[PDB]
């Protein structure tokens, strides 16, 4: 594995919006997608530019308490200060007792654990969250990568209805990372596409039992990911993704997966400005 | 006869579905005029098959038909947004394809369509068919892979908000089998509420079919599963296996939901088809 | 296959709490962990020491209707009465149709089905529940075993922002049995630890596709379990477990998994 070091900025975007970024003034909601290969180490300097206590906490990666991102463990960041966080990962290895310790690979995420409560409630509400992708050697890689976060009644903290439009060309390999947050329950559904329900979303071997699905529970704290071939067997056009909970979709958690023609030209019913 | 097809192809089935108002509270799909049910027909295919459906809208409302899991283009997706809905009194033609697994030019495997899927209205009352679904336009869509074992009995259980198959006066459906029969359950959640489907005295592997695929299958054995809006799954069991005949409750396990009436009976009769102690027939 | 006979006592522990115990005055919430290997049978005399109608009901195990612990099936226990419940179990076997009947093994649970409502709503609420672990031959056994029940807004009926502290020493094999109950949805999450999402939470062949997870839905009626090695690759300390539903955690569904030093001391 390799050791990588990055600086991450926590910034107030607006009254309602706090976010993480890889450069000063570049914070986004959702935050940047962080990638590691199993066994890599990532070291992050979290620069808190805000007037709030806040922090950084991951899922799935190896971290000790001093990296856990909680006030309880002395791991948060005071306003105008920087904290070093250290995330490790490992390949699968055999234990002395005969058993198998699984490698770190999976679709994970990170987010504030310190802002407004010990559980980071206000931090998450206002957008400090981001995808953490830990790859196993040999995993297939995407042309396009989308992070979808159902945060309470919001998709990626967008306004009443502006749900992100995610875009691909017909036939491209597309990676969806999906993360739930907040106090609300959701079900993530994508029209016209489907994946196997397992780590990568695709068949690993003839013995793989996993069912094919077009929809999956996305609850607070939960993350998964998968890959599809854009418009495979269905063609291009505007493909809806949304929360299948009926009053939720009506309140606007619905958005478009836009699949253009292979050459990148717009499909039938679309009006370009 | 020679010559047969150069490459094996699936079957193309053509059907008509009537969307009808049943009462002020109820809308449904049916295979014949006056034949609407809630839930509607179980539609069944094998991987590779095509299903060409004429939806005849007999109501005064805009509504549609949209599936999960099968292959459809935007013109079949069942949304107003894609010009895919059906205006009052009109007929729209929908096409649903399916495929066997295949190897991609990139070397990865495209999974075949098989699984327990479902269909339902996307156009009525909202771009999401909230009213359609609330009022009963939904049904199971079962796509099978070759060699799948076939049920003797088949039950569609839809948790739609606080109702099972929209049964709102006590009267959650009793499902029946004779002891030893292979029985198939298809579970579909709908609406705004969260559920856990639980079945007394029976259990299944949590995977596509509910049974062991090979000696490598890791899937836990379960008697209960989340069934939330949009979610379907299915499994098979041998009725009363290792347990015996009787009234076997199935219910949502959310406490306040079961207490409100989301519970029903799985009635396992004796092998010969006779009532077990406690149950009378008439 | 082994047959085992035990007495179970339903007791009122306090005003807000009912429990099961293996001895008089010994009732706890959650109740005792019942352990079986596939093929074994567990025969239970439930002694009802309360003034309330109540019952005992298993998941996963083979039981006839006479043992399903519901009023509708004549299976409940009146105040003062003693009732026999019989749970059998089996190893996998091949059916005549070629298909495979799965053995019982799993992380299961048992609870009241008769108190307050035909669904045992009051009995579940006031704490009558426990873990039922059915093991398959060759399964690895824990050094420590924790039952966590998310019951409405409570963790093991701690209603006071008192959620249990579960303890282990660094490096010990730890089993978690997770059970949901009540009317709320939850997600169970464990800091600094992860497990394969499958029956045992660990890998049995290179073919197991199961994702590795640190969090899972735990809703009413639902159970599951896994083993971890305490503090593996992460060191000892106060490691949070909690419900990831934000308003829930803020309201007190959070507790500690305390990993001590290899020698038992605090970190
Ligand atoms: C069938 O009769 C009913 C009985 C009870 C209720 C609810 O009040 C609740 C279950 O949802 O009962 C509880 C009972 C005991 C303790 C707590 C409880 O809830 C918090 C609804 C019923 O019909 C709809
Ligand atoms: Cu946490
Ligand atoms: Cu939602
Ligand atoms: Cu859909
Ligand atoms: Cu988290
Ligand atoms: Cu214009
Ligand atoms: Cu939709
Ligand atoms: Cu009515
Ligand atoms: Cu329910
Ligand atoms: Cu049960
Ligand atoms: Cu749907
Ligand atoms: Cu008569
Ligand atoms: Cu029950
Ligand atoms: Cu109290
Ligand atoms: Cu919770
Ligand atoms: Cu965490
Ligand atoms: Cu139960």
Examine the fold and report which residue of A119, A139, A159 is the final residue of a domain before the chain moves on.
A139
Residue C258's φ and ψ, nearest 5 degrees, are -95, 115
- Residue A182: closest C-alpha in chain C: C246
Question: In this structure, are residues A20 and A10 in contact, taking their beta carbons and an 8 Å threshold?
Answer: yes
The single residue listed with the structure tokens 């959702």 is A30
| DSSP per-residue codes, C140-189 | PPPSEEEEEEEETTEETTB-SS-PPPEEEETT-EEEEEEEEESS---EEE
Test C73 with B256 for CB contact under 8 angstroms. no
The phi, psi pair for B137, rounded to 5°, reads: -90, 100
Q: Is A67 exposed, middle or buried (0-12, 13-18, 19+ CB in 10 A)?
A: buried
> Are A95 and A144 in the same domain?
no
Q: Is the dihedral of CA B189, B195, B199, B202 positive or negative?
A: positive
Q: Which of C12, B150, B47, B278 is nearest to A233 (CA)?
A: B47
Say if residue A55 is in the same domain as residue A179: no
Q: Is C220 on the interface with B (CB under 8 A)?
A: yes
Q: Which residues of chain C have a CB within 8 Å of the CB of B221?
A: 60, 102-106, 199
Size of interface B-C (CB pairs under 8 A): 118
My answer on whether omega of the bond before B3 falls inside 30° of 0, hence cis, is: yes
> Please, are residues A198 and C210 in contact by the beta-carbon 8 Å criterion?
yes
Both A35 and A96 in one domain: the answer is yes
Residues with Cβ within 8 Å of residue B171, at least 6 apart in sequence:
none
Asked if residue C4 lies in contact with residue C40, where contact means CB atoms within 8 angstroms, the answer is yes
Using a CB-CB cut-off of 8 Å, the residues of chain B touching A202 are 108-109, 111
Please report, for residues A191, B203, B229, B252, B280, the alpha-carbon distance to residue B193 in angstroms, rounded to integers and kept in the order given: 21, 24, 7, 11, 35
How far apart CA B54 and CA B139 sit, in angstroms, is 16
Which ranges in B108-179 belong to alpha helices (H)? 130-134
CA of B7 to the centre of ligand 15 (A): 53
Burial of C242 (0-12, 13-18, 19+ CB in 10 A): buried
Rounded to whole angstroms, what are the CA distances from A33 to A8, A36, A56, A109, C126?
12, 10, 14, 9, 45
The separation between the first and the last C-alpha atoms of chain A, rounded to the nearest angstrom, is 46
Residue at token pair 């980071």:
A120
Minimal CA–CA distance to B139: which of B190, B209, B92?
B190
B194, C219 Cβ separation under 8 angstroms: yes
CB atoms within 10 A of CB A4: 14
- Ligand 1 atom nearest the C-alpha of C183 is 11
Beta strand pairing status for C3-14 and C41-48? parallel
**Gap between the terminal Cα atoms of chain B:** 53
**Do C164 and C252 belong together in one domain?**
yes
Nearest to B99 among A185, A233, A254 (CB): A233
**Contact list, A212 vs chain B (CB under 8 Å):** 69, 111-115, 208
> Which residues does residue A257 pair with via DSSP β-bridges, in sequence order?
A166, A239
Q: Is C34 exposed, middle or buried (0-12, 13-18, 19+ CB in 10 A)?
A: buried
A195-196 and A254-260 as β-strands: parallel, antiparallel, unpaired?
unpaired
Q: Which of C121, A177, A243 is nearest to B194 (CA)?
A: A243
The DSSP call for residue C199 is: S
Parallel, antiparallel, or unpaired: how do β-strands A237-243 and A254-260 relate? Answer: antiparallel
CB atoms within 10 A of CB B214: 12
Is the minimum CB–CB distance between C68 and chain B shorter than 8 Å? yes
B32 CB-near residues (< 8 Å, 6+ apart): B18
CA–CA distance, B96 with B55 (Å, rounded to integer) = 13
Would you say the CB of residue B2 lies under 6 angstroms from ligand 1? no
User: How many domains does chain A fold into?
Assistant: 2
* Spatial separation of the C-alpha atoms in residues A139 and A91, rounded to whole Å: 13
Protein residue with least CA distance to atom 16, ligand 1: C122
A247 and chain B in contact, CB less than 8 A:
yes
Q: Are A77 and A55 contacting, i.e. CB atoms less than 8 angstroms apart?
A: yes
CA A163 to ligand 7 centroid distance, Å:
14
Terminal C-alpha separation, chain C: 45
The radius of gyration computed from the CA coordinates of chain A, to the nearest angstrom, equals 19
Q: What angle do CA A104, A106, A107 make, to 5 degrees?
A: 140
Tokens representing residue A205 in the block: 């071997």
Chain A partners within 8 Å of C211 (Cβ): 106-107, 198-199, 224
> Residue A228 has which token pair?
């599809």
Tokens of C97: 């149709």
Q: Do C209 and A221 touch (CB under 8 A)?
A: no
Cα B134 to the center of its chain, rounded Å: 16
Last residue of a domain, one of C139, C157, C180: C139
Contact B71, B97 (CB under 8 A): yes
- How far is the C-alpha of C129 from the C-alpha of A80, rounded, in Å? 49
Q: Rounded to whole angstroms, how far apart are CA atoms B266 and B239?
A: 9
Q: Is C250 in contact with A117 (Cβ distance < 8 A)? A: yes
Experimental method: X-ray
Assess whether the C-beta atom of C152 lies below 6 angstroms from ligand 1.
no
The DSSP letter of residue B97 is B
Q: How far is CA B178 from CA B153, B197, B266, C116, in A?
A: 9, 22, 10, 33
Neighbours of A88 (CB within 10 A): 20
Q: Give CA–CA dist B29/B121, Å, rounded.
A: 10
Smallest Cα distance from C192 to chain A, Å: 7
User: C33 with C21: CB under 8 angstroms?
Assistant: no
Q: Could you tell me if B132 and B153 lie in one domain?
A: no
Whole-number Å distance between alpha carbons of C1 and C234: 41
Q: Do residues A47 and A98 share a domain?
A: yes
Radius of gyration, alpha carbons of chain C: 19
Counting from 1 in the atom list of ligand 1, the atom nearest the Cα of C119 is 10
Residue of C nearest to B238 (CA): C101
* Inter-chain residue contact A208 with C212, CB threshold 8 Å: no
CA atoms within 13 A on the CB side of B124: 27
- Tokens encoding A187: 């079900």
| C-alpha closest to that of B182 among C99, C178, A262, C181 | C99
| Contacts with A205 (C-beta within 8 Å, 6 or more apart), sequence order | C207, C209
Ligand whose nearest atom lies closest to the CA of B223? 10
- A184 with C246: CB under 8 angstroms? no
Structure tokens at C174: 């730890």
Cβ of B198 under 8 Å from any chain C Cβ?
yes
In which element (H, E) is residue C109 found?
strand C106-111
| Ligand 11 centre distance from Cα of residue A253 (Å) | 14
DSSP chain A: --EEEEEEEEEEEETTEEEEESSTT--BSS-PPEEEETT-EEEEEEEE-SSS-B--EESSSB--GGGS--TTTT-SB-TT-EEEEEEB----EE-TTS-EEPP--EEEEEE-SSSSSTT-HHHHHTT-EEEEEEEPTT----SEEEEEEEETTEETT--TT-PPPEEEETT-EEEEEEEEESS---EEEETT--EESSSSSS--STT--PPEESEEE--BT-EEEEEEETTTTT-SEEEEEEE-SHHHHHTT-EEEEEEE-TTS---TT----
Last residue of a domain, one of B148, B169, B202: B148
- Do residues C112 and C56 lie in contact, with contact meaning Cβ atoms separated by under 8 Å? yes
Residues C15 and C121 in one domain: yes
CATH of the domain at A211: 2.60.40.420
Give all chains having 3 or more CB-to-CB distances under 8 Å with chain A.
B, C
| Chain A residues with beta carbon closer than 8 angstroms to that of B106 | 140, 173
Half-sphere exposure of B179 (CA within 13 A, CB side): 18
Shared-domain flag, residues A78 and A98: yes
Q: How far apart, in whole angstroms, are the C-alpha atoms of residue A9 and residue B2? A: 71
Q: Identify how many contiguous H helices and E strands chain C contains and give both numbers.
A: 2, 21
β-strand pairing of A82-87 with A41-48: antiparallel
Token pair for B229: 């809006």
Contact C215 A221 (CB under 8 A): yes
Residues B155 and B181 both lie in one domain: yes
B233/B207 Cα distance (integer angstroms): 9
Q: Tell me which chain C residues have a C-beta less than 8 angstroms from the C-beta of B201.
A: 63, 65, 68
Angle, alpha carbons A84-A90-A91 (nearest 5°): 160
Torsion of CA B86, B88, B89, B91, to 10 degrees: -10
Distance between CA atoms of B33 and C243, rounded to whole angstroms? Answer: 51
- Distances in Å between the Cα of A195 and the Cα atoms of A134, A199, B115 are 19, 11, 12
Rounded to an integer, what distance in angstroms lies between the CA atom of residue C68 and that of residue B250? Answer: 12
Q: How far apart are CA C192 and CA C170, in angstroms?
A: 12
Q: How far is the CA of A199 from the centre of ligand 4 (A)?
A: 23
- Cα B253 from Cα C182, distance rounded (Å): 8
Nearest CA to ligand 1 atom 24: B260
| Residues composing chain C | 267
B251 vs B58: CA distance, rounded Å? 34
- As a whole number of angstroms, the distance between CA B128 and CA A255 comes to 12
Order of strands across the sheet that contains B138-144: B43-46, B138-144, B115-120, B66-67
Nearest to C207 among A59, A124, A208 (CB): A208
Range of the domain at A170: 140-273
Pick from B186, B200, B278: which is nearest to B231 by CA? B186
The CA distance from A255 to A180, in Å, is 16
Of the candidates A122, A129, A137, A158, the one whose C-alpha atom is nearest the C-alpha of residue A222 is A129
Whether B88 and B159 map to the same domain: the answer is no
Chain centroid offset of residue B59 CA: 23
For chain B positions 104-163, those within 8 Å of chain A (CB to CB) are 104, 106, 108-115, 117, 126-128, 130, 133-134
Beta partners for residue B20, in sequence order? B28
> Smallest Cβ distance to C237: which of A65, A102, A119?
A65
Nearest to B121 by CA among B162, B97, B92: B92
Quick one: resolution in A?
A: 2.3
**Do C1 and C133 fall into the same domain?**
yes
The protein residue with its alpha carbon nearest to ligand 1, atom 22, reads: B259
Please tell me which residue of chain A has the smallest CA distance to B69.
A214
CA distance A186 to A169: 28
- Nearest-Cα distance to chain A for C57, in Å, is 28
CA-CA distance, B132 to B26, in Å (whole number)? 9
Ligand 1, atom 12, lies closest to the CA of: C121
Q: How far apart are CA B129 and CA B131, in angstroms?
A: 6
Residue identified by tokens 């060699």 is B147
Sign of CA dihedral C12, C13, C16, C18: negative
Closest ligand 1 atom to Cα of C117: 4
Neighbour-count burial of C119, counting CB atoms closer than 10 A to its CB (0-12 exposed, 13-18 middle, 19+ buried):
buried
Q: What is the CA radius of gyration of chain B?
A: 20
Quick check: B212 contacting C, CB < 8 Å?
yes
Does C235 lie in the same domain as C144?
A: yes
* Atom in ligand 1 nearest the alpha carbon of residue B257: 11
C82 close to C46: Cβ distance less than 8 angstroms: yes
| C-beta of B32 in contact with ligand 1 (< 6 A) | no
For residues C256, C261, C262, C265, the Cα torsion angle rounded to the nearest 10 degrees is -100
- Answer yes or no: are the C-beta atoms of B87 and B58 closer than 8 Å: no
Q: Is A41 on the interface with C (CB under 8 A)?
A: no
Whether A197 and A222 have beta carbons less than 8 Å apart is answered as no
Strands C3-14 and B263-269: unpaired
**C203 vs C54: CA distance, rounded Å:** 40
Structure tokens at B33: 């005029």
List CB contacts (< 8 A) between B196 and chain C.
Answer: 180, 219-222
**Nearest CB to B231: which of A209, A215, A229?**
A215
């Amino acid at each position: 594995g390799t050791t990588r070091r990055i600086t991450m900025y926590a910034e107030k975007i607006s009254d309602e919006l706090y976010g993480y970024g890889l450069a000063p003034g570049g914070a986004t909601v959702p935050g940047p997608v962080l990638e590691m290969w199993e066994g890599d180490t990532l070291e992050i300097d979290l620069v808190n530019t805000t007037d709030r206590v806040l922090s950084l906490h991951p899922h799935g990666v190896d971290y000790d308490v001093n990296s856990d991102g909680t006030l309880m463990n002395g791991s948060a960041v005071m306003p105008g200060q920087t904290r070093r966080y250290t995330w490790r990962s490992h390949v699968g290895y055999r234990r002395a007792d005969g058993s198998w310790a699984e490698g770190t690979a999976g679709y994970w995420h990170y987010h504030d654990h310190a802002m407004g409560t010990e559980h980071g409630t206000e931090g998450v509400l206002k957008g400090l969250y981001g995808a953490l992708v830990v790859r196993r050697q040999g995993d297939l890689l995407p042309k396009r990568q989308f992070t979808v976060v159902f945060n309470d009644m919001m998709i990626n903290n967008r306004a009443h209805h502006d749900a992100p439009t995610f875009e691909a060309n017909l036939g491209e390999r597309v990676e969806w990372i999906a993360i739930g947050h907040g106090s609300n329950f959701h079900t993530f559904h994508l029209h016209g596409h489907r994946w196997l329900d397992n780590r990568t979303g695709m068949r690993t071997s003839e013995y793989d039992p996993s069912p094919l699905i077009d929809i999956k529970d996305l609850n607070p704290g939960v993350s998964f990911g998968f890959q599809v071939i854009a418009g495979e067997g269905v063609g291009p056009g505007m493909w809806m993704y949304h929360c299948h909970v009926q009053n939720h979709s009506d309140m606007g958690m619905a958005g478009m997966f836009l699949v253009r023609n292979a050459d990148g030209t717009m499909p039938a019913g679309v009006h370009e400005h």
